[PDB]
Write a protein that binds this ligand. Structure first.
Ligand SMILES: CCCCNC(=O)[C@H](C)C[C@H](O)[C@H](CC(C)C)NC(=O)[C@H](CCSC)NC(=O)CCC(C)C
Length: 370
């Protein structure tokens, strides 16, 4: 069953996680970034300095041109291309072939990453945010419509080259410990969720919970950092600075520009706090919390690290540094996202990443932004 999909993801730190796919007839093999923050399937289809290979439409007898252009902008990076369809398979996934929409990327700007080893992107979110419009059916919708694959997938992203698993069509219980805790998908466009409380080293940030979700909160395997709205980012950095005031850092460290180093094995993990995000639960007035260790938001790049929490003007993004400690179930069928402690979690000496509940939280619906 699912054992064939365990360990089907690879990556380089800070450069995304990718799965192997084939497109066209005869099959052309490509490494494809797994991106829950978007909804277009697109591949390099022309030479590029950072591409070692690309999709050659003229060599595929099953390619069909849709005679329509497309452009997709991301938080950082963008591409344009030509829409079409072709047959697609996932060698270390389910034994199926689907005809899917594919954008052939012909021009791009700050999209491909030098040395990342991937040549395309698999947008796993919903049609509502697909370009050029929501009539372009995303890959996973095509997969579910054309085969018997159930309407869900799960991601285990493993940190410190990196690896992981994308279980297509189900949940693999060997990939997590403890219980799964579920939060509602607020609206099917991004994987949007509602954060109802934030604590740092056990102290409530004491902000209006609308601030945590201004103007949305999303889960995105294609973003490295935890990205926070301006007011929340400032409160969080103020608290983290205070907890670590024992040591001194450049001010560009807190902006993500400069790295900090310590003698190998002497990193003072103890002076950096844990961060708890409380998420809306499945029953009335109930939440649960996920706890993040500094080993997740200090990304290794002697031992040197970059601060991987940064400021956003488009809402909270729960990126890889959040997802890396957990097994995350995208349960589209039941419109919910599950979190459990990952089997590939990092080890602090006295602290552990956790998923804990239940908690009582009043007036949770008021935390969503309108
Ligand atoms: C069209 C509507 C949907 C748009 N969705 C998005 O823009 C989502 C929120 C972001 C999307 O996941 C892209 C993916 C990237 C590979 C381009 N990520 C980024 O733009 C983020 C922006 C970071 S701002 C410090 N890129 C990274 O974190 C760098 C590492 C990645 C190459 C793995």
């Amino acid at each position: 069953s699912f054992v064939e999909m365990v360990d089907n993801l690879r990556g380089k730190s800070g450069q995304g996680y990718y799965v192997e796919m084939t497109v066209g007839s005869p099959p052309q093999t490509l490494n494809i970034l797994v991106d829950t923050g978007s909804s277009n399937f697109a591949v390099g289809a022309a030479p590029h300095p950072f591409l070692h290979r690309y999709y050659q439409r003229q060599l595929s007898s099953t390619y069909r041109d849709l005679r329509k252009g497309v452009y997709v902008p991301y938080t950082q990076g963008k591409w344009e291309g030509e829409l079409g369809t072709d047959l697609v398979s996932i060698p270390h996934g389910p034994n199926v072939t689907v005809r899917a929409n594919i954008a052939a990327i012909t021009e791009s700007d700050k999209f491909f990453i030098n040395g990342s080893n991937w040549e395309g992107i698999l947008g796993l979110a919903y049609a509502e945010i697909a370009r050029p419009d929501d009539s372009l059916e995303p890959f996973f919708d095509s997969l579910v419509k054309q085969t018997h694959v159930p309407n869900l997938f799960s991601l285990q992203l493993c940190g410190a080259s990196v690896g992981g698993s994308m279980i297509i069509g189900g949940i693999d219980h060997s990939l997590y410990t403890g219980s799964l805790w579920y939060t509602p998908i607020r609206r099917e466009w991004y994987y949007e969720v509602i954060i109802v409380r934030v604590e740092i080293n056990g102290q409530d940030l004491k902000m209006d919970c609308k601030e945590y979700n201004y103007d949305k909160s999303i889960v995105d395997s294609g973003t490295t950092n935890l990205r926070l709205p301006k007011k929340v980012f400032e409160a969080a950095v103020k608290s983290i600075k205070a907890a670590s005031s024992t040591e001194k850092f450049p001010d560009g460290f807190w902006l993500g520009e400069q790295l900090v180093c310590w003698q190998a094995g002497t990193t003072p993990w103890n002076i950096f706090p844990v961060i708890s995000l409380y998420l809306m639960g499945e029953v009335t007035n109930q939440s649960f919390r996920i706890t993040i260790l500094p080993q997740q938001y200090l990304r290794p790049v002697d031992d040197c690290y970059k601060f991987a929490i940064s400021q956003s003007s488009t809402g909270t993004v729960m990126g890889a540094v959040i997802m890396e400690g957990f097994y995350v179930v995208f349960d589209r069928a039941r419109k919910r996202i599950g979190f459990a402690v990952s089997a590939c979690h990092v080890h602090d000496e006295f602290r552990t990443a956790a998923v804990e509940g239940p908690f009582v939280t009043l007036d949770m619906e008021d935390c969503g932004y309108n």
